[PDB]
Amino acid sequence: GLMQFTLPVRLCREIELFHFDIGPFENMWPGIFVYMVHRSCGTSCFELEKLCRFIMSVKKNYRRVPYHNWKHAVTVAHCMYAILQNNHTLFTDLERKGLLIACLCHDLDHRGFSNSYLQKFDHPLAALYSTSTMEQHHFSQTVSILQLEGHNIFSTLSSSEYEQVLEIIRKAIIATDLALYFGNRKQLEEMYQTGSLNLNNQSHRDRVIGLMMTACDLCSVTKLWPVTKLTANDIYAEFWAEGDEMKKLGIQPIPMMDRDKKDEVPQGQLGFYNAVAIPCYTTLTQILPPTEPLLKACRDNLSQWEKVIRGEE
Numbered sequence: 001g002l003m004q005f006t007l008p009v010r011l012c013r014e015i016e017l018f019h020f021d022i023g024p025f026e027n028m029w030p031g032i033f034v035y036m037v038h039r040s041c042g043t044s045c046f047e048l049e050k051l052c053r054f055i056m057s058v059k060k061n062y063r064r065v066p067y068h069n070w071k072h073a074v075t076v077a078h079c080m081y082a083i084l085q086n087n088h089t090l091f092t093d094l095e096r097k098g099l100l101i102a103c104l105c106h107d108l109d110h111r112g113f114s115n116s117y118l119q120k121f122d123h124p125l126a127a128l129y130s131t132s133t134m135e136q137h138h139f140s141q142t143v144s145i146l147q148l149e150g151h152n153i154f155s156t157l158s159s160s161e162y163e164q165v166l167e168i169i170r171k172a173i174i175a176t177d178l179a180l181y182f183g184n185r186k187q188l189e190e191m192y193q194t195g196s197l198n199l200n201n202q203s204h205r206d207r208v209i210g211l212m213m214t215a216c217d218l219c220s221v222t223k224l225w226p227v228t229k230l231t232a233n234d235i236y237a238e239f240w241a242e243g244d245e246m247k248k249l250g251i252q253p254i255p256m257m258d259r260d261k262k263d264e265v266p267q268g269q270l271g272f273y274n275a276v277a278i279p280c281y282t283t284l285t286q287i288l289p290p291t292e293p294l295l296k297a298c299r300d301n302l303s304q305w306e307k308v309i310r311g312e313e
């Protein structure tokens with residue numbers, strides 16, 4: 001009732017920053033997440049007992065893969081928290097509620113394989129969800145966990161509010177399908193430039209939330225360089241295992257997934273920051289000026305990859 005969550009001083013201060021790293025102590029991550037809900041939403045948003053039980057079931061449904069794991073979920077939520085806290089007035093009570101939850105749940109039960117590998121392996125999920133395969137699965141898992149006894153953190157919401165929140169969550173989670181991001185950022189680019197962008201048009205909010213989700217999801221590129229570099233190892237550990245699996249199916253994997261192309265990593269990161277990351281944080285900074293530190297950090301890390309290529313590290 002009168003129970004606050006507090007973090008040690010360095011965390012208390014640094015968690016407010018975009019480049020915060022949640023650290024290696026897994027047992028502190030639930031507390032960190034709850035801390036973020038309480039400041040971002042209010043101590044009255046969710047029934048504490050239910051929330052903790054929800055957090056633990058979510059944790060239990062992430063798998064021990066090198067990248068798309070429980071640490072990633074909490075990291076993507078922390079980036080969303082920073083966005084929300086730096087844009088206080090722009091978001092409904094329901095969005096604040098739904099978005100941190102969406103981030104925590106966005107990769108639920110990920111297996112460490114891309115949509116493309118599932119389709120080529122012909123996994124049951126690819127038959128059930130022909131596009132955004134994993135992402136529809138992630139949302140499905142969120143609904144399941146929400147329906148477990150004592151797990152309904154949205155129990156105090158009205159029937160229509162409940163339906164609205166699940167709908168924010170659904171679209172948010174779908175938007176993490178990077179294949180959808182390009183078209184989404186293009187529309188947003190154009191709408192901002194022709195001045196048509198309207199935060200009262202619901203379909204416009206959706207696109208903006210979608211862009212936020214991409215930004216949070218890629219936030220590894222906005223951290224301090226050693227964090228960025230070390231996460232990159234986890235990212236390729238997954239991709240290369242998928243690459244191996246492609247080869248097992250009799251298929252040349254794309255260069256990104258082929259461990260024989262280890263040497264081109266610095267250059268693959270370059271293309272990635274240029275094709276994906278920078279454009280994402282750019283348009284996001286245009287639409288939401290106080291998120292500029294993400295762009296600035298992303299640019300610093302691109303420069304670090306450039307330095308890696310030039311033999312300077």
Ligand SMILES: Cc1cc(Cl)c(C)n2nc(CCc3nc(N4CCCC4)nn3C)nc12
Pocket residue numbers: 178217218219220221232235255256257261262263264265266267268269271272
């Ligand atoms: C989804 C995602 C998210 C994030 Cl936060 C990052 C930092 N990354 N990096 C990547 C791989 C980029 C890449 N590497 C390569 N190759 C070709 C041969 C050597 C490497 N090509 N590309 C496009 N993906 C992601």
Ligand SMILES: [Mg+2]
Pocket residue numbers: 106107134176177
């Ligand atoms: Mg995902």
Ligand SMILES: [Zn+2]
Pocket residue numbers: 072076106107176217
């Ligand atoms: Zn993700």
